[PDB]
């Protein structure tokens, strides 16, 4: 009847396509779905959940709660960072294992703003001030508190607020960061002042760190790799 | 379902065709493009750019700046042309290597108006008059200044304007000139008067020549040949 011409591309299965397929149970009525609470509509809405960053990946400390706290102490008051942290959400083992990172693993380009958090979880009576600094990419992580105070940085008073939060900003020439290897910036924490305390209270506080995506974050070009 | 008949031509790949093909990344969002300045929309908009004509293709002078100037001198005042030039944009090595020519190379018929230019680039104090003549096709290039003055020709005073421009007109019976071999016309330059000068200023001026297409120019039936 109607004259037609099959062009090239006919009879090839193309995984990456979708066309109305004939259904194998056309009579069968499907069970209606219910309003189960907690429907996810977009992967980003998981990247948006602040999760813990394994700061210590020392064979010993890893694979146990210990890989998540930072032993804020009161030992010789050195001048290096308390914990430096490169913001290559994918190019860094520390950040790689996070949830954010887990979703990033399934994509090649992603580009947004990471927001971090540092919940202090030491004595209620303990008190001090730590300097948290954002070394922007291209540069070098600061090694002295001084250098870091010159840069951007919060001066977070332990005693006043148990948690310093802070959204690092989005940047990239190539307006989509590549997950693979090589920049991204850093985040360090400096003892600004020692963590002074009243009575026998231990001189061993700890700090937890979070990370997540902000609304501006997004990913593109999916790429699963998981195999065996 | 709908009865159909596959006519001849089905299942043949025809390089020269275009049909909506199934896309391999239907989910993938493409990077939006920016307003990069200098977008070209049509090849002609390159043919429209006056470029330099290698007047001398002598093995020696060629493949170096020297293949582009004309040694206007003050030696025995001969009566031949200073530089004759056949306007076969493709059938002539001199004009072949130009940009115009480069685009012409990718087509069989083209048909418009070439506009030439002769920028004199000798002393500011130097002065003279050269006769530039358009011998139309079919005829023979003029060999004496006299014959050329009878034809069409500008009398371009060096001293008054450093550059004689002049659009040669479009002609052809076969209202599309064929790039291959055999007419097209000529363009000669005659010393009209010697190039007189004041003091030790050298008696060696030079002249540059340009060529390009005018709005009426166009090409048709593409034909790439480049191989190895």
């Amino acid at each position: 009847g109607l004259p037609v011409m099959n062009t090239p591309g006919s009879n090839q299965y193309l995984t990456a396509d979708n066309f109305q397929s004939p259904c194998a149970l056309p009579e069968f009525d499907v069970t209606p779905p219910i309003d189960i609470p907690g429907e996810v509509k977009n992967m980003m809405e998981l990247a948006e959940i602040d999760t813990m960053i394994p700061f210590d990946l020392s064979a010993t400390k890893k694979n146990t709660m210990e890989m998540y706290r930072v032993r804020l102490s009161d030992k010789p008051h050195t001048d290096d960072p308390i914990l430096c942290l490169s913001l290559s959400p994918a190019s860094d083992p520390r950040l790689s294992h996070t949830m954010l990172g887990e979703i990033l693993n399934y994509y090649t380009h992603w580009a947004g703003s990471l927001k971090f958090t540092f919940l202090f979880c030491g004595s209620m009576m303990a008190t001090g001030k730590l300097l948290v600094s954002y070394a922007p990419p291209g540069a070098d992580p600061p090694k002295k508190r001084k250098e870091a105070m010159l840069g951007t940085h919060v001066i977070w008073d332990i005693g006043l607020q148990s948690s310093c939060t802070m959204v690092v900003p989005w940047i990239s020439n190539t307006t989509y960061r590549q997950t693979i290897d090589t920049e991204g910036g850093y985040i360090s924490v400096f003892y600004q002042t020692r963590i002074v305390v009243p009575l026998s209270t231990p001189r061993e506080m700890d700090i937890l760190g979070f990370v997540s995506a902000c609304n501006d974050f997004s990913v593109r070009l999916l790429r699963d790799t998981t195999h065996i | 379902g709908l009865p159909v008949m596959n006519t001849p031509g089905s299942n043949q790949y025809l390089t020269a065709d275009n049909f909506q093909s199934p896309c391999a990344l239907p989910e993938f969002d493409v990077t939006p493009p920016i307003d990069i300045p200098g977008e070209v929309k049509n090849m002609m908009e390159l043919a429209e750019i006056d470029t330099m004509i290698p007047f001398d293709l002598s093995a020696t002078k060629k493949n170096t700046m020297e293949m582009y100037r004309v040694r206007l001198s003050d030696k025995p005042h001969t009566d031949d042309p200073i530089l004759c030039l056949s306007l076969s944009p493709a059938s002539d090595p001199r004009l072949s290597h130009t940009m115009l020519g480069e685009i012409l190379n990718y087509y069989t018929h083209w048909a418009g108006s070439l506009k030439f230019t002769f920028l004199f680039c000798g002393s500011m104090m130097a002065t003279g008059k050269l006769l530039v003549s358009y011998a139309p096709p079919g005829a023979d290039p003029p060999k004496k200044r006299k014959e050329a003055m009878l034809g069409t020709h500008v009398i371009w005073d060096i001293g008054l304007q450093s550059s004689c421009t002049m659009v040669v007109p479009w002609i052809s019976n076969t209202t599309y000139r064929q790039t291959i071999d055999t007419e097209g016309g000529y363009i000669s330059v005659f010393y009209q008067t010697r190039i007189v000068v004041p003091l030790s200023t050298p008696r060696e001026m030079d002249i540059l020549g340009f060529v390009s297409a005018c709005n009426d120019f166009s090409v048709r039936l593409l034909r790439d040949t480049t191989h190895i």
Binding site: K41, N42, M43, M44, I103, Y107, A111, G112, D216, S218, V219, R220, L221, L222 | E27, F28, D29
Partner: peptide, 7 residues
């Protein structure tokens, strides 16, 4: 930026 590719 858009979220589309990660719905």
């Amino acid at each position: 930026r858009s979220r589309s590719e990660s719905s």
